[model samples]
Each structure stands twice: as C-alpha cells, then as structure tokens.
Target: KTVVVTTILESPYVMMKKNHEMLEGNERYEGYCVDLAAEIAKHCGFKYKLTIVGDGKYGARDADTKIWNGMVGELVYGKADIAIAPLTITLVREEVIDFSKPFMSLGISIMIKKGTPIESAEDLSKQTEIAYGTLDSGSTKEFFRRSKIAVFDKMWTYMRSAEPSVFVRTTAEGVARVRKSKGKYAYLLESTMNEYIEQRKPCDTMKVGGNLDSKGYGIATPKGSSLGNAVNLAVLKLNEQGLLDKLKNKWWYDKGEC
Candidate 1:
C-alpha cells in the first residue's frame, strides 16, 4: 500500500516551488520535510504520497469537543499513514499518537525587532511597552496557557485577555506584526523558525534570550502502526550518518539569503 504522509505548508519545511502550478503531485513542493520524506521512504522501502493537512494547522485539540484537528486528526481518523513535518512532540499529543525518535530539536523563543527593549518573557510581562503573542493553536500557545510557572502563566493571562488580540494565526503573520509594530510587538515562536526568519532578507528580526523550554520534532503515526518502528529506526540511522544535519544545512544555511 502506498503510504499517505500528511504535513503542512510551512516554509523551510514544506513549501511550493516557484513553478508549482506547472507541476503536479509531490513535484509541486520542496523543503526539509519534502526531502526528509524521500529519505524515510527510501529506507523504509515504501511508495508514498504527500498530502497537506486540510486545516493548515500543526494540530491541536479543541477544548470543547475534545477532538483533534489538523494533521493529528487526519492520523487519528486513519486519513493518513504518517506525519512528516516540524510537528512538536508534546505530552498531550503523545497521548493519541506515537512519535518517532526526534529528527530535530528546538524550543520556544522570542522574535523581536533589532532594537526592542525586551530581552526576556519577564521583561515583556513587566512592562506594557512591547506586546507579545504566539501562534494561536500549537504547543507554544498551549505551553503558555497551561504553564504553572509564574512568569509564563502571567504572560498567558495577559495574552488570553488582551484587547485587540495578541494571538496570531500563523508565523508569517506574527513576524509581519513584529516588523510593522515598530518595536511595539514581539512574536514568540520555535527557535528553529525564529532563527530561519532572522537569516532571510529584510533581516530586522532577531531571536533574543534563551529558549523557554526544550522539545523535539517527531514523525507521527497512528498508535500501534507497524510503520512506526521502521520510521524510528530510519531516523536513528539518518542521525547517526549525519544526514539530518546535512539536510538542515542544505535547506537553511546553504540557501540562506541574509
């Protein structure tokens, strides 16, 4: 059976080529996940098709319905055989699906304009000078929402109730807000993404301070799927052979513009 791999259209992970409209099927896309999928398929000896998550979300559980959405929902309902994306491995997500060994590691980080006065979450929380927010529906949002730590919990309280809404629907939107806010807004996102944006043209953004928490990105599969074992071993082999690091350099550094 051809494996159905579900992912999202995030830059440096999965993006349409400039000639995507002239292409068809998987040929339309390229990026870290695109290349990673090819590697995994080669090692696992399976033909596969890549499908974008319908909802365009990383995956989050709806609070009221207790239903999974985005890539997670697709796997939970058997719509896809696997997820190969920069999907964070969180305890909540782990409850419903199995994850392969981490292919990449990162943590929550702050993205700010070059001269922003804020250096840390506490700095933003203490002063009303610069506002901050996170992606509305991923582990970063959930992290702040559920944090018992005083600083993060306080920051979440402010973001959850702030007038004009601080939460953003996408990383691009968040970065744009930071760029246009003129030092008035800060964006909190994964370190990998924050760093990637910093190296892009119009390089006005920079990641500040250390990470808020540490985590890793994993390939997800439906619970008990036999493919999980093969995928895990494949990832380990790739890491041991330094292919994972090479892929990161290929997509992020070698092609960087700034």
Candidate 2:
C-alpha cells in the first residue's frame, strides 16, 4: 500500500541543494522533517511517496475568498495520506483535520540582523525605524495579528499597510530580507528555525524576545485515518530513545553554526 506524504521545501526543514542535482525524495534528501519522516515510516511499516506542495501557502482561510490551502487542504481533499511538514497545530487548522501528539514544541520569535541595537521583542515594538513583519499567511503572523499586547497590536497595524511586494511569501524569504536589509528588517518566525539560523552563517541574525506565543508541530492525518495512533506513538518512542534529539544535534549542531 502506498501512503502519499506531503511536505514542503524550506531550509533546515526541507531544502533543495545548490546544484539541483538530486532527484526528488532521494535518501540524501535530508532535513529535520526529511529525517523524521523517514524514521516514522520505518517504525510504522508504511511505504510512502514524498511530494512537495505546489502552493507555498500554509493553511489559511482567505478572509476575502474563504478558501483554504497547504497541508490542511491536502488532507481534507484526500490528496495526501499524511503530512510530515513542520505544521503547527491550531484551532483553525485542527477544525479541518486531526493532529497527532506534537513531535516538537515551538514558539514565535523575532529574527533581527546581528549587531542590531534591538535586543528584544520589546525593542522592535518600541521602534519604527526597524521594520518588522511575519510570513504572510502563517501561524506566526496570525498570532501577532490576534494578540492584545500593545507592541504587537500596533505592529499589526503597520503590517497590514505594508506593500504587498515587501510582504514576505515564506519564512526563508523573510530571513533573506533580514539578511539583506541589515538591521532594518526583522522577521517574526518560529523559535526553532530562529535558533537554527543563529548558529548558521553569515551568523547575521539572532532571535530576540521571548517566544511571542507557544505551539506544537504535529504529524497530521485526515480525521479518519487509521495510521494516526501508530504514527503518534512512533514519534513518542523516537523522542524517548533520544533519536529526535540526536537528529537535531546532527543537523543543527554538527552541520550548523559552530
């Protein structure tokens, strides 16, 4: 039996090499999610196909059109049997699908160019000269958009007025913008990715502020899929056996910033 697994192309999580030389789904295709998915399948006794989503959008309900996209839509529409992407479990996303117990804990944080005067989320909130934004339609953005805190509340207003072209399409794009803009642009993103980047060259950015909010990344399946229990258990076992930690150190420590 074939399990159609859906993933995305994102650095530290999933990425294409500079050479573009490798075929899709090759064993050498390694990243956080790539390795995790491989282990999950091994323990679950499932054969899978890895397919990247054509639409880069994460799950969202279009305010104007009321449409959904990304992994949520993939499972809802039966296009995939499972989603091993770094997908967060949220009330809105959970409404359309079921998420297994979290495989990782994460929170939103701000990524600012290194040596930037800004030292914390408070700093970004207090200054206008240092522009800030989140991935266009992701959980991090939504978290800030829905927050009642003063700094973020005001920042949300600025984001809504920012030019569409300037709005980043993804976290990697936002990270690149921060790198190029120097200290002027800060990206709000998951803490896990932010920590990974801090250890990476150009060592140009650092995560500041405590996490803006907390969330978990879970393996997702359609509501009725029978694999959910076994997959979730496998993830817990991997965590207990220290496989998850070992892999994180391998990719983020061994291969990342020294």
Candidate 3:
C-alpha cells in the first residue's frame, strides 16, 4: 500500500520547485524534508505519497471547539497515514497523536527586519511601535497563548489583542509580512526557518537573541498507527548515521546566497 503522508509547503523543509506546476506528484517538491522522507522510506521499506496538509497548518486544538486542525487533523481523521514536516512536538499533541523520536531540534526565535530595534523577547514586550507575531494555529502561537512566563505572558496579552491581527496563516506569510512591513513588523517563529531566511536573497531579515526556548520537531502519526514504530526507528538510525545533519547542511546552507 502507498502510505499517504501529510506535510506542509514550508521552505528549507518542503519547498515547491520553481517550476512546480510543470511537475507532478513527488517530483513537484524538494528540500530537507523531501530528502528525510526518502531516507525514512528507504529504511522503513514503505512506499509513501506526500500530500500537503489541507489547511496548511502544523496543527492545534481549538480551545473553544475542541476540534483539531492542520496535519494533526488529517492524521486524527485518517485522511493521511503520516506527517513528516517541521511540526513541533508539544505535550498537548502527544495526547492525541503519536510522535516519533525527534527528527530535528529547534526553538522559538525572533525574525526582524534588518534594522529593527528589537533584540530580545523583552525588547518586543516593552515596546509598541514595532508589531511582532507568530504563525496562527501553530505551536509558537500556542506557546505564547498558554505561557506563564512574564515576558511571554505579556507578549501574548498584546498579540491576542493586537489590531490588524498579528497572527499569520503560514511561515511564508509571516516572512512576507516582515519583508513588506519595512521594520514595522517582526515574526517570531522557529530558529530553523529564521536561519534559512537570513541566508536567502534580499537578506533583509535576521534572527536575533537566543532562542526563547528549546524543543524538537517530531514525525507524527495517529495514535498507535502501524507506521509509528518503523518511522521512529528510521529517524533514530538516520540521526545516528549523521544523515540528518548532512541533509540540514545540504538544504539550509549549501544553497545560501546572502
């Protein structure tokens, strides 16, 4: 059986090729997650098809509705067999979905226009002129929404109330807002994406300050799915063999332009 995988269209992870419209199926995408998936399938010996998540989100449970969305929802409903994306592993998700050993590690980070005055989470919390936000319906946003730490709590208080709605639909949208806001906006996202963008052309954005917190991204599956064991084993093997590091360098640094 061809296992259906639900992922996201994120740069340095799963990027659409420049001429993607002319391509079809798996050939339509490339990047770190693409390579990682190939290796996983190789080790797991399962043929899989990659499909973008319908809602283009990582996943989150709505506080009011109690319904899941994004890659997590696809798995919960059996719409796909697996999720192999830059989806962070959070305690809330672990209750409903099984996650493999972390395939990659990252932390919440800030992305700023080249000359933005902000240097820290504290910096942003104390100011009002420069607006900052995280991707909507993702772990980062949830982190702030549920945070107890003073700086993050304060930041969340503002974000939940901020006008023009600082939450973005995707990481690409967050990056685009940062690019076009001309120092008026900053995007708080994963360090991985921030570093990737800092190397890209135009290079108007930079990641600043230490990461707000540390965490890892795990390949997820519906609770107790048959694929979970094999996927976890593959990730452990790939990481131990240094294949994960190699792929990260290949996708994130080898193509650096700025």
Candidate 4:
C-alpha cells in the first residue's frame, strides 16, 4: 500500500532539487529527511508519496478553535498515513500521535551573527539593545512559553511584548533576520539548524551557548497506527548501525561546504 507522507520543505531536512520541475515524484526532492524516508520505506515495505504540509506548519492546535494544523494535523485528521519530517517529539504532540524511536537528536539553541558579544541566554535576557526571537509556533518558542526557569521566563516576557514582535515565520527568515540585523538581533532555534548554518557561507552566523534543552526528531504516525512498530524498529536498527550518523555528516558537513 502506498502511504501518503506529510512533510515540510525545509533546508537540510527536505529541499527541492535544482531543475526540479524536470523531475517527478521523489526525484524532485533531496536532503536528510528525504534520505531517511527512503530508508524507512525500504525497511518497512511501504510505498510513499511525499506531500508538503498544506499550511507549512509542524503541527499545533489553535487555542480558540482547537484545530490541529501542519504535518501533525495531516496525521491526526487522517489526511496522511505518516509524517516523515523533522518533527520533534514533545509531550503535547505525543499525546495525539505515535512517534518512532528518534532517527536524529537535537535541542533548542541560540543563533547569532558571528562575533556578536553575547555568549549565553543570560546575556540576551540582561541586555536591552540586542533584540532576539524564535521561529513562530516551533518547539523552541514553546519551550520559552512553558518554561518555569527565571532566565527563560524573562526572555519570554520580553519576546512576547517586544515592539514589532521577535517571532519569525520560518527558520530561513529567522536566520536572514540575524544576518541583516547588524548585531542587533539573535534568533532562538534548534541546534540542528544552527549547526547547518554555521557551515554555509558567507559564514556570518554561529550558535552560542549550550542547548537549553535536548530533544529528538522522530517519524510520526497517528495514534495506534500499524506502521508505528515497524518504524520504531527501523529507526533503532539504523541508529545502531550508524547509518544515521553517516547521513548526518553527508548532509550537514560534507555537502554544506565550510
């Protein structure tokens, strides 16, 4: 059976091939998650069609209407059989969907223009001149929203009320903001994204401070879906065999071109 897989078009996770209009089906895309989905399908014995999430979100519930959106929505609403994206495994998300053992590990981290004075989250919180923010609706943002720690809470307070808003619509957009802000802005994002950008030219930004919290990205299926067990086993096997590590290097470092 062919599975309808929901995903997002994000660099190093999922991306269009050059001259992609000439390519069709899976040939049109490439990247780490694309490679990963290929492996999962090979091992689990299911054909899949990758469709980008319509709303271009990772999946979150609307506070007022209680509707889920993004890849998580595609899974929950049965619009897709599975989600093969860099979706994080979080408590609220796990409550609605089943996740495989993580295929990759990451965590919340800080991204700043290279040579920026700031070195830690505490520095951002204590200062006023340098504005900072995160990708809107992402786990890193939610980490600050739900955090009880004093430092994070203070940073969240500033971000929510800052003039013109600190939140950005996409990871690329957030990184661009950092590059253009002239040391006046810092972006909060995942370590994986930070790691990828630091290697790419113009080599203008870098990740600072250790991760705020460690998290992992996992393949997702709707609750109780039959594919869950197979994906979990496949992910576990791949991790143990170190294929995941090999893929990570191939994409983030080898292809990234420091």
Off by over 4 Å in 2: 17-24, 163-166
For all candidates, the clash counts are: 0, 1, 0, 0
Which residue pairs in candidate 2 have backbone atoms (N, alpha carbon, C) closer than 3 angstroms, thus clashing? 199-257
| Best candidate, lDDT | 1
Worst 10 residues of 3 by lDDT: 54-63
Relative to the true structure, how large is the alpha-carbon lDDT of every model? 0.94, 0.83, 0.92, 0.92
- lDDT, model 2, position 193: 88
Residue-wise C-alpha lDDT for candidate 4, range 1-258, written one tens digit per residue? 789999999889899999899999988999999999999999999899989899999999999998999999999999999998889999999999999988888988999998889999999999999999998996888899999999999999999999999999999999999999999999999999899999999899999999888889999999999999999999999899999999999989997656
Q: How good is model 4 by TM-score?
A: 0.98
lDDT of 1 at 89: 93
Estimate, for each residue in 1-258, the C-alpha lDDT of model 1 and write its tens digit: 999999998889999999999999999999999999999999999999999999999888888999899999999989999999999998888999999989999999999999999889889889887889999889999999899999999999899999799999989899999999999999999999998899898989999999999999999999999999999999999999999999999988898788
Q: lDDT tens digits, residues 109-201, model 3?
A: 999999899899999999999999998878898889889999999999999999989999878899999999999999999999999999999
The candidate with the higher lDDT, 2 or 4, is: 4
Superior candidate under TM-score, 1 versus 3: 1
Per-residue error for 134 in candidate 2, Å, reads 0.7
Q: Which regions in candidate 1 have their CA more than 4 angstroms from the true location?
A: none
Q: What is the lDDT of candidate 4?
A: 0.92
Return the TM-score for each candidate structure.
Answer: 0.98, 0.93, 0.97, 0.98
